[PDB]
Design a protein around this ligand. Structure first.
Ligand SMILES: OC[C@H]1O[C@H](O[C@H]2[C@H](O)[C@@H](O)[C@@H](O)O[C@@H]2CO)[C@H](O)[C@@H](O)[C@@H]1O
Ligand SMILES: *[C@@H]1O[C@H](CO)[C@@H](O)[C@H](O)[C@H]1NC(C)=O
Ligand SMILES: *[C@@H]1O[C@H](CO)[C@@H](O)[C@H](O)[C@H]1NC(C)=O
Lengths: 474, 17
């Protein structure tokens, strides 16, 4: 593991993406600026990031689908990103919305990721339009020593499009906000979709143990006629020389499969001492046609957020298909509870597929298994508080003595925030700090300078007390 | 239920800053 260090960049990105191509963009950056860029692809980087960033470590830049980023931002772990409007206009507005959280942009969008149906044209010249036709197709193919369909059943990303087709969702959105009281698998549609999956397994058309590697090998060796995967998989299929197409996902009950669409995004660690370098790299090297092309040549990004390069990519029917599936899907929420949702659905699908639980039992436990994950979203780090403390005590030395007329309260560090000299009788205020994820930084903290130039003391212990109660009320 | 309400509740009473 390369360490965070002023005057270089460390980047984390998932091992299924074009990390070698990204490193080439890094080399171009280093050539122009002298700044080394190191790209790493640790396992479970999306789980590891908050804990290592919380103690001031981690990468300068983290890449993942945008659904993880709200959790990181709510914990104060991501830098605000501040592109100019001319730069913003180069990317599709829906991609910016995916990375807008509590009013702020919290990452740069890179790629628009949707799963598609991938099929072997030699085994299956006309791919099925519906999930319901797959059992009969599998029977026909098994007579030839083949199967119809293999895809990853261990990660819920891959099974979600079927669950969502006829009514599955993560969280209800209403009156401008998500309602997290229920996960949207408590409906007949979600149940019907999962039941269809389980039935494919009971009827021996799929195996509950199939994972990404097993499915990939079977498709790329010509053993199964179809798989479900994203554009990052295409390189290996090209190598195999299977004559493949990429097409719309099958429908279920006449309704499109509805993949959860991820916007692969690059966040800047709040703890990085290289924030300006990271901005330069991302805006002026990576988010250009040349930069994205360098990544794409390693592993395909699929559809991208950058308009100029997407317009070129969309000449490829595989990319047009990726966008068709994306537009028939739903952009994932970015709220902190998405990780909870995913963990719950993961368990429900594995349990139902394997017969460890019935479909009804598995979907019922998804509600409480999601809620069980909520306290673990409380990840906090002390760095911001301590930087603010140091700044405060310095500024209290350097600012000239008070030049107003009358009794006033003295400049002070209250433990979480800095205050200036304040006239008697004034209720001073500032924004809530982003130290704790149950705090809303758009709410206000107040501190009352009483009638005599003395700061307000809490009556319960007669100690000087700033009022943070609006930060996490309700 | 709104997204901040699921988190453990940070103390803001007396004996905090
Ligand atoms: O399976 C749940 C998982 O789904 C998504 O992760 C995708 C990711 O978006 C893709 O970039 C690709 O790498 O595959 C992953 C599935 O293995 C969510 O983004 C992720 O948070 C979630 O845990
Ligand atoms: C307030 O600050 C002034 C100047 O630093 C100091 O003389 C005074 O004793 C302080 N008062 C209190 C109540 O701490
Ligand atoms: C703190 O602020 C809230 C909101 O204005 C108010 O309801 C409460 O009375 C205040 N508490 C104290 C002790 O000042």
């Amino acid at each position: 593991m390369a360490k965070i260090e002023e005057g270089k960049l460390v980047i984390w990105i998932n091992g299924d993406k074009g990390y070698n191509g990204l490193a080439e963009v890094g080399k171009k950056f280093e050539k122009d600026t002298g700044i080394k860029v190191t790209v790493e692809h640790p396992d479970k980087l999306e789980e590891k990031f908050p804990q290592v960033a919380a103690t001031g470590d981690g990468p300068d830049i983290i890449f993942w689908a945008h659904d993880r980023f709200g959790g990181y931002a709510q914990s104060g772990l991501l830098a605000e990103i501040t592109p100019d409007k001319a730069f913003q206009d180069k990317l599709y507005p829906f991609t910016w919305d995916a990375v807008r959280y509590n009013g702020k942009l919290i990452a740069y969008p890179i790629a628009v990721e949707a799963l598609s149906l991938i099929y072997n044209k030699d085994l299956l010249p006309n791919p099925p339009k519906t999930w319901e036709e797959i059992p009969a197709l599998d029977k026909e193919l098994k007579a030839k020593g083949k199967s119809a369909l293999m895809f990853n059943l261990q990660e819920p990303y891959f099974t979600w499009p079927l669950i969502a087709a006829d009514g599955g969702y993560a969280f209800k959105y209403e009156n401008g906000k998500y309602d997290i009281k229920d996960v949207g698998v408590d409906n007949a549609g979600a149940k019907a979709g999962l039941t269809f999956l389980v039935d494919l397994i009971k009827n021996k058309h799929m195996n509950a143990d199939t994972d990404y590697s097993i499915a990939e090998a079977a498709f790329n060796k010509g053993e199964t006629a179809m798989t479900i995967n994203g554009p990052w998989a295409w390189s290996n299929i090209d190598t195999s020389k299977v004559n493949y197409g990429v097409t719309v996902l099958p429908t279920f009950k006449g309704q499109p499969s509805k993949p959860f669409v991820g916007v692969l995004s690059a966040g800047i660690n709040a703890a990085s001492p290289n924030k300006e370098l990271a901005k330069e790299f991302l805006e002026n090297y990576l988010l250009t046609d040349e930069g994205l092309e360098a990544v794409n040549k390693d592993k395909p990004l699929g559809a991208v957020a950058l308009k100029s390069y997407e317009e070129e990519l969309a000449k490829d029917p595989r990319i047009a298909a990726t966008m068709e599936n994306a537009q028939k899907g739903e952009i994932m929420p970015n709220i902190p509870q998405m990780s909870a949702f995913w963990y719950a659905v993961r368990t429900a699908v594995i349990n139902a597929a394997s017969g460890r639980q019935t479909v009804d039992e598995a979907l019922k436990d998804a509600q409480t298994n999601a809620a069980a994950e909520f306290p673990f979203l409380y990840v906090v780090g002390r760095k911001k508080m301590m930087d603010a403390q140091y700044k405060c005590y310095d500024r209290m030395q350097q600012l000239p003595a008070y030049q107003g007329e009358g009794p006033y309260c003295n400049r002070t560090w209250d433990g979480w925030l800095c205050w200036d000299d304040t006239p008697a009788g004034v209720l001073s205020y500032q924004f809530c700090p982003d130290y704790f994820p149950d705090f809303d930084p758009s709410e206000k903290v107040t501190k009352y300078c009483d009638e005599k130039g003395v700061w307000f003391k809490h009556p319960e212990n007669n100690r000087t007390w700033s009022n943070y109660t609006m930060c996490n009320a309700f | 239920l709104h997204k901040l309400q699921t988190y453990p509740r940070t103390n803001t009473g007396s004996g905090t800053p």
